[PDB]
């Protein structure tokens, strides 16, 4: 997260780290047995780490659980990153409490101008590299489709929205992919892609979760 702040240990209790020997993507716990993340985060051998703040220190609130199965969206296109979403089932149910909580799926889509919280352990520098060990947070508005599509011509589909600041300075970044965009208590976005991080006129692009609720609910119930 570039230009964000330290969340505070376990203030984002639905945030997940996906680990395959090291943190490589975030995710969101949507109930005790299921995580949603980005399909471009797919790997074989995922361990889901819940209750994390510093990902390099065991501070006592963590639950480390292996993934039993991963389901990438049936129409995921890795070239356009259209339908960038995947579900990950846990081998055993998470114990929910104040530090490990699930996030709600949306009943409808959020409008332009709604303020959202975006969180992750990704790169904190735009020109350069610096990786945080504690969770970073950023409040950002959903931008209008016109300014999202003018920023990326011919690349935004109906399944994507932009969030952030066109002056730049504040954005999601690599290492944040798969992570949550929560607006009004609902999971509305997934960190998907962007051009670099925090550049002017290059906002982040997020998977629009309100278009996938039927697919998520049908898939978790049959698996």
Ligand X SMILES: N=C(N)c1ccc2nc(C(=O)c3nc4ccc(C(=N)N)cc4[nH]3)[nH]c2c1
Which residues make up the interface to ligand X (CB under 6 A)? 24-25, 40-41, 171-174, 176-177, 191, 193-194, 197, 204
Instruction: In whole angstroms, give the CA distance from residue 168 to residue 197.
Output: 8
Q: Residues 28, 53, 84, 192: which is the catalytic one?
A: 84
CA separation (Å) from 88 to 27, 47, 79, 181, 190?
9, 10, 22, 18, 14
Residue 173 contact partner, candidates ligand X, Ca ion, none, CB within 5 to 8 A by sort of partner: ligand X
Minimum separation from the CB atom of position 102 to ligand X (A): 23
Residue 41 contact partner, candidates Ca ion, ligand X, none, CB within 5 to 8 A by sort of partner: ligand X
Cα 54–Cα 58–Cα 62 angle in degrees, nearest 5: 85
Instruction: In whole angstroms, give the CA distance from residue 75 to residue 77.
Output: 6
For Ca ion, give the closer residue by CB, 52 or 176.
52
Active site residue 40: yes
Instruction: In whole angstroms, give the CA distance from residue 196 to residue 203.
Output: 9
Give binding residues as ranges. Answer: 52, 54, 57, 62, 171-172, 174-175, 177
For ligand X, give the closer residue by CB, 65 or 181.
181
Minimum separation from the CB atom of position 40 to ligand X (A): 6
Active site residue 158: no
Instruction: Write the CB contacts of 43 (distance below 8 Å, at least 6 apart in sequence).
Output: 18, 20, 24
Instruction: Determine the straight-line distance between the first and last CA of the chain, rounded to whole angstroms.
Output: 33
Minimum separation from the CB atom of position 17 to ligand X (A): 13
Tokens 């003018």 locate to: 150
Active site residue 192: no
Catalytic residues: 40, 84, 177
């Amino acid at each position: 997260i570039v230009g964000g702040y330290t969340c505070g240990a376990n203030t984002v209790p639905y945030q997940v780290s996906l680990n395959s020997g090291y943190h490589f993507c975030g995710g969101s716990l949507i109930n005790s047995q299921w995580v949603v993340s980005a399909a471009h985060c797919y790997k074989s051998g995922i361990q889901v780490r819940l209750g994390e703040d510093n990902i390099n220190v065991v501070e006592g609130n963590e639950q480390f659980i292996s993934a039993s199965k991963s389901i990438v969206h049936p129409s995921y296109n890795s070239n356009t990153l259209n339908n960038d979403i995947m579900l990950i089932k846990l081998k055993s149910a998470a114990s929910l409490n104040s530090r490990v909580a699930s996030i709600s799926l949306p009943t409808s889509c959020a409008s332009a101008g709604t303020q959202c919280l975006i969180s992750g352990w990704g790169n904190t520098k735009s020109s350069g590299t610096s990786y945080p060990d504690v969770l970073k947070c950023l409040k950002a508005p959903i931008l209008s489709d016109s300014s999202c599509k003018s920023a990326y011509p011919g690349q935004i589909t109906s399944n994507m929205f932009c969030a952030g600041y066109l002056e730049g300075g504040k954005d999601s970044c690599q290492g944040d992919s798969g992570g949550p965009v929560v607006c009004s208590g609902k999971l509305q976005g997934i960190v998907s892609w962007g051009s670099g991080c925090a550049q002017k006129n290059k906002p982040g692009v997020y998977t629009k979760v309100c278009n996938y609720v039927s697919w998520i609910k049908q898939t978790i119930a049959s698996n």
